[PDB]
Amino acid sequence: QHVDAESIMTAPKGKLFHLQFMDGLLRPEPSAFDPPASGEDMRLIYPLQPISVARSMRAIVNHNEVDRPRGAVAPSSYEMDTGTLSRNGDLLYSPVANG
Amino acid sequence: ISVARSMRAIVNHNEVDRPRGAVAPSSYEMDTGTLSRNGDLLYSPVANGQVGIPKLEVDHISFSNVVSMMTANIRTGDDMAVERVNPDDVRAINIRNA
Amino acid sequence: KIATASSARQADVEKPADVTFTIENV
Amino acid sequence: LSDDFKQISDPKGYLTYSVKYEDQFTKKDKLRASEADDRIVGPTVNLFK
Amino acid sequence: MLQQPTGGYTTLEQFAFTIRNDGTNATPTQFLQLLSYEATENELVKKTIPTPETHLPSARNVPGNVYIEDAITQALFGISAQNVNAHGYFSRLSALALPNTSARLGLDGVIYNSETINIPFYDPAAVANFAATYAKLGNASTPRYRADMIDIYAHVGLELAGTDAERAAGVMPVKRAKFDSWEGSLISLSRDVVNWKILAFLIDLCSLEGEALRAFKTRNRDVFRMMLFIMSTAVAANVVNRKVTKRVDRVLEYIGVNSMRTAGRTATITYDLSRHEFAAKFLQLTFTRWNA
Amino acid sequence: VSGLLMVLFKVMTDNRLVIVGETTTPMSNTLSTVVNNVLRTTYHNNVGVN
Amino acid sequence: VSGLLMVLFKVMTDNRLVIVGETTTPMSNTLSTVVNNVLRTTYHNNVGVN
């Protein structure tokens, strides 16, 4: 999808805009022999707030075969905690320490 | 005559005895040690103290070795290409000075 | 049935390296 | 009896994982789990490939 | 929270820095013994390092646990590190620089935004001190704030190659480093250096004062010199082998001269221009702190 | 905002009652130890992901 | 004797450069312990004999 600056300045209030934002982290390095770019890719639209709130994980590939890529996101520990039922029935995370 | 022979009589006398004249494989056939500090193949050290003998130093055959290799094809297909750009005037070229 | 003898030798498999288009790392 | 509840098996959550792939990445080595470990671990692994 | 020892975090054996010497573990100092230098005609005069910009990147809140240690070590020593100038990590870093922040820098080198009691972490005053300078790595890319990528390396040479007379003098001949060496000696050395928890080092460099800090610079000079060594191999104009009496001697030319090489090679790790900006900025801050 | 109400509503009215579905009881030897340490005898044939 | 020269020649001129072929990464549990002690994570699908 695309959004001209005109539309961003003139879209009615209360309409939900649907912006798109690339995660460029999984972009493999350019061939050594690709021609140089004389020009410059540019950008206008940015979020004011974090967008990736829904994101559990990111860049499930290896930098090298052993390093993590910069900006890679491991799953949160609580995604895997499956503790126990409370004395009354309610769900709980496992105790953090023995006490 | 049997210089080429690695092994012999791969069957059991009884179910547990070896047949007389049976030949087990030489240990070096299985040694697959390491690369030397410079790159060359070696047998494992014999004892804890001594360094491992180069495989090429001695007359044994070793049928396991560490082969270095690329992880994928080196012909990616991104062949180098250039922009040749000719002299503007053939008369103006400075042939001179080395 | 008559007793018999046979031979074997390990097969060659040395292909030219495959041209994959996939890459494993970023 | 009153139909107070909707008895069901193998429940669906309110939340689910979604996942976007850049298909050009693929590990060359091919992992071989036992069929059982594939039966359990597998649906996870196909998703987070 | 791990309370800092009076000598700094690096006194703890948990943070010992070590490198394999043809595969056997060794202190950095005993590797630096191997180096030897053929001087050439050219000179390296050390210029004064410009004082770093006061402006920290804005302490914007960001999702996830940022891994600051791996980020720094990869951008300085990793094989083709990527997105080294991405702003988010240093946004969280400057968040650590705030007087009463909730964020913690664990010994893992990760920046957890929770007060997560389960994972031990450095004393917050110390990391406040540390981020207070190193968040400036966030402006490694911005045109206003770019560090010199050339003259700064003169200092690198002095702190690595330079004899005590040359160091007090501030000038040394451009040198050609060399050592008895194994295959992939430079790469593997970098692989060992990359696993270093340099956060302990930088935090001690920023938090220690007076006699403790002086003792730190003396005790850790060889460590710093190893990181400097890895950078110099990333920027050395040429790196080659010299067979001599059935012993290869690796040669790097030249120490103290950034070639601005960007294209990758077999012999050593390589800096793309973004890595150049990053390392140059890093050295600006780290040398500014080292010379105080 | 409307969506949120109809989420909340659809949750306030969620009267599903779980019944055990098809299960399997892998023998310990079939599983790699890391999986056997997680598995607790039986489990649903429709494992989700995690 | 001619054979030996053409062996030596054919070896002096052996410019093969190895590339990793198809591989497998067996899980430890699948292998009998004696094999797992020899195997080092991945291995070529075309193991030779030994």
Q: What is the DSSP string of E83-101?
A: -TT-SHHHHHHHHHTSTT-
Query: How was this entry determined?
Result: cryo-EM
DSSP conformational letter for A77: G
* SS3 of residue A5 by DSSP: helix
C-alpha count within 13 angstroms, C-beta hemisphere, residue A17 = 17
Cα B82 → chain centroid: 37
Q: Determine contact: B4 vs chain A, CB below 8 A.
A: no
**Do the Cβ atoms of E30 and E222 come closer than 8 Å?**
no
Cα–Cα distance measured from residue E220 to residue E32, given in angstroms and rounded to the nearest whole number: 13
B88, burial (CB in 10 Å: exposed 0-12, middle 13-18, buried 19+): exposed
Number of domains in chain E: 1
CA A73 – CA A60 distance, rounded (Å): 8
B5: its two tokens: 């022979």
Residue G30 carries which side chain, given as an amino acid letter?
T
First-to-last alpha carbon distance for chain A, in angstroms, is 54
Peptide bond between residue E254 and the one before it cis (omega within 30 degrees of 0): yes
Count the Cβ atoms, other than its own, within 10 Å of residue D35: 10
Distance from CA of G18 to the nearest CA of D (A): 16
B-C interface: how many C-beta pairs under 8 angstroms?
10
- H or E stretch including G2? helix G2-12
**Nearest CA distance, B36 vs chain G (angstrom):** 19
A 33-62 → E contacts, CB under 8 A: 50, 52-53, 55
- Compute CA distances A11 → A3, A49, A51, whole Å: 10, 20, 21
Contact at CB, E22 and B37, closer than 8 angstroms:
yes
All residues of chain D having their beta carbon less than 8 Å from the beta carbon of residue A61 are 25
* Burial per residue of C6-25, b for 16 or more beta-carbon CB atoms within 10 angstroms, e otherwise: eeeeeeeeeeebeeeeebbb
Domain that holds residue E150: 1-292
Beta bridge partners of E240: E251
Residues in chain C closer than 8 A to G21 (CB atoms): 15, 18
| Axis crossing angle, helix E198-207 with helix E273-290, rounded to the nearest 10 | 40
d(CA E280, CA E137): 9
Q: Does the beta-carbon distance from G27 to F31 stay under 8 Å?
A: no
- Tell me how far apart the alpha carbons of residues F10 and D2 are, in angstroms, rounded to a whole number: 20
